[PDB]
Design a protein around this nucleic acid. Structure first.
Ligand SMILES: Nc1ncnc2c1ncn2[C@@H]1O[C@H](COP(=O)(O)OP(=O)(O)O)[C@@H](O)[C@H]1O
Ligand SMILES: Nc1ncnc2c1ncn2[C@@H]1O[C@H](COP(=O)(O)OP(=O)(O)O)[C@@H](O)[C@H]1O
Ligand SMILES: Nc1ncnc2c1ncn2[C@@H]1O[C@H](COP(=O)(O)OP(=O)(O)O)[C@@H](O)[C@H]1O
Lengths: 257, 120, 257, 120
DNA sequence: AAAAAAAAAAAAAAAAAAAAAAAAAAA
DNA sequence: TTTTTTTTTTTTTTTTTTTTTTTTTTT
């Protein structure tokens, strides 16, 4: 059944090239070369997490020689209230090295060893908002000691916790800001989304004035919300038998979500 | 005594389906297939337990092989002042798995493992 | 230098189909489908572990669905003086499952739990002798508790340790034996080697009376010796600029060993 | 590339002499001769770390004699929240001596021993 | 503010092998 | 005497639980 292919494609998420993503990538390469830690702060549903993964996928571990592979970029996600011991364990596991059992100081020695062995040009701490307040001291330790550029990708609370420790604020003074979509940028993103993401047989002219206004008001510049609503209404049209999303279909979803 | 048999029936547990239950069931199957989290807000003693039980009755896990059962839905009730450890423990017990000993990080890993095995 | 690449290809490891290998794969698949335990006893340098690796390669752990992957074959190689914990831990790590902290009693149940999610009809234990008799009870607990075709790959010491327990003997009574290569069978294997593995552009005629004399004395019917000796002789002849192995070179390899 | 060599030289770290460093060195030498304990207080990113390290490189551990190397100056950087064990361990390792398994009392005795043997 | 949940550090208890050396014994 | 043969005798690596103390969090 052909319809199952459309359903399956729409169920899964994807990556859609955007100006914001390329901006972040061009910014990140400079600090990787410069070996200087940075900060990234923006709202949720802006796609910053997607751009982080997209940056990491381009740079992979190279193992031509028989020796350990060089992982230039490490991306990790600490859990809620993640402590120093747990944070070190995550880094060790990311590098395919056995995690020895012991106290926090032992884990620290193990982590420094495995980080020195590989290249590690950049270390990324994803959603540092849930990172424990005590950990920002050990993160700074690694930053100064190993010459590894460290990037913190978090929300607004990050600014709150960073300011309390004068040294941690000194370590990551500079930052890049993520924002929301608006105006012509939002409209262009919506039309480009219809051309790239949506596989519906007939274009609904979502860039038209009668429907693009609904998308503008409902998504409120959140690329995540835009993704959700577009994919959902697009899937819904097909069971009824529609080649394109209708204005009423667009209105029905936003009220529920 | 026949009278006492009727009394035992009257003092027992039973279900009378309501329009609230059917409406919620349709919406819940929608949210389940859509895989979207949501809330349900309303007054107590309005059949919340009945809705939960009648929904759970429709989807019954089947375990024809030694692999983990094909469980579509998980059902838990957090205790008063429930912490993270308790959420993890209740999810683990519901799916018929041994509760690990240790801290919240260990419980978290254990819970994700058991959740990943089944459909959930 | 092209000669360097031509030389380097020979130092490589390769598998050559043989009569004994073909027998082993069918026999083990029969025991696997039957879910019944059996034993393996052969003299050293007979490639039975190579055949076990090949049998493991034939069956590929499929991941059709999100539910735990269906690994049908388990292959663990114990060390020296292995206890219950190391055995259980190797089973756990082989299936790519986290080794948690805790007691040995909990450790024993971790492996039992991970085994059910995957098929794991046949567990194959290479170097079964190097194990503790107090671990044979755990190994046989697998055979009694679950329908698992536990296979014990071992030498003569395996027989010696197994007979000391009637229960283990009854559970692992079925077995397979190996022989050696002699006479025309050895010459056939030698020519098969020369045509399948020898990377020299010109035939060395290793089935000649003189070369067969040297090889019969040097290998004594052991396939590992044949492999090693022929690779080394080919390299020694390449160092003199030849397209094939001279007779004196083969004799020199025999003298060194 | 010549330009890349100059750029790499700029990217590297070098040590420059300042009056603040000379003042610190004189102060520390006076204290060393008097064997009087003291402290150094200042703001971050002021470079006092480098000045102390520079004092260390002034005089190294002479080992010309047949007896163990004599270390006049020990310099350590304790990690975050280091207790009364890791400190002793770091001292011992800085003196190129083995670490023995034991308790805090054992580490304490071992540390006093290695501190008495060398000048320190 | 003042009770309730969380990482280091000491301290106690128990088999299971293995080797070596000596002493006695038997034709 | 040569060898056997045992028989003691003596000397050696892994596993587990239980307090205390202390520092952060919340309420
Ligand atoms: N370029 C993109 N392509 C597809 N989906 C995207 C893109 N950017 C963002 N998203 C959507 O946004 C969500 C992730 O954003 P999020 O993790 O909240 O980033 P941040 O933490 O920076 O807000 C995903 O659900 C994803 O579908
Ligand atoms: N059929 C075969 N295919 C490939 N190599 C083989 C084969 N038979 C024997 N060998 C050789 O045996 C050597 C390793 O043998 P090994 O794995 O130790 O088996 P086993 O332990 O049974 O002796 C390898 O160097 C290999 O070249
Ligand atoms: N004497 C010095 N010469 C050159 N650079 C210095 C000096 N002192 C400090 N710095 C700069 O400061 C950094 C090291 O000083 P730092 O350890 O931060 O001092 P503190 O720890 O007291 O803040 C180096 O990156 C270096 O660039």
């Amino acid at each position: 059944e052909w319809l199952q292919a459309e359903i399956a494609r729409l169920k899964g998420k994807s990556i859609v090239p955007l100006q914001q993503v390329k901006t972040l990538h061009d910014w990140l390469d400079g600090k990787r070369k410069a070996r200087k830690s940075c900060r990234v702060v923006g709202e949720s549903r802006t796609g910053k997490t997607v751009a982080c993964d997209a940056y990491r996928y381009r740079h992979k571990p190279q193992q031509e020689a028989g020796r350990p592979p060089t992982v230039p970029v490490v991306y990790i996600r600490p859990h809620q209230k993640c402590g120093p011991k747990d944070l070190f364990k995550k880094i060790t596991e990311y590098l395919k090295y056995r995690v020895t059992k012991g106290t926090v100081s032992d884990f620290r020695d193990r982590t420094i060893e495995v980080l020195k062995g590989c290249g590690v040009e950049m270390l990324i701490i994803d959603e540092a908002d849930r990172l424990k307040p005590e950990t920002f001291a050990d993160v700074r330790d690694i930053a100064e000691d190993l010459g590894i550029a460290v990037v913190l990708v978090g929300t607004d609370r990050l600014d709150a916790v960073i300011k309390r420790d004068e040294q941690v604020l000194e370590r990551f003074r500079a930052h890049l800001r993520f924002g929301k979509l608006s105006g012509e940028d939002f409209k262009n993103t919506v039309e480009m989304w219809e051309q790239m993401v949506l596989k519906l047989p007939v274009s609904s002219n979502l860039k038209s004035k009668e429907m693009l206004r609904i998308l503008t008001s409902a998504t409120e510049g959140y690329i995540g919300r835009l993704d959700e609503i577009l994919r959902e209404a697009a899937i819904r049209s097909l069971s009824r038998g529609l080649k394109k999303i209708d204005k009423a279909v667009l209105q029905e979803v936003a009220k529920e979500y």
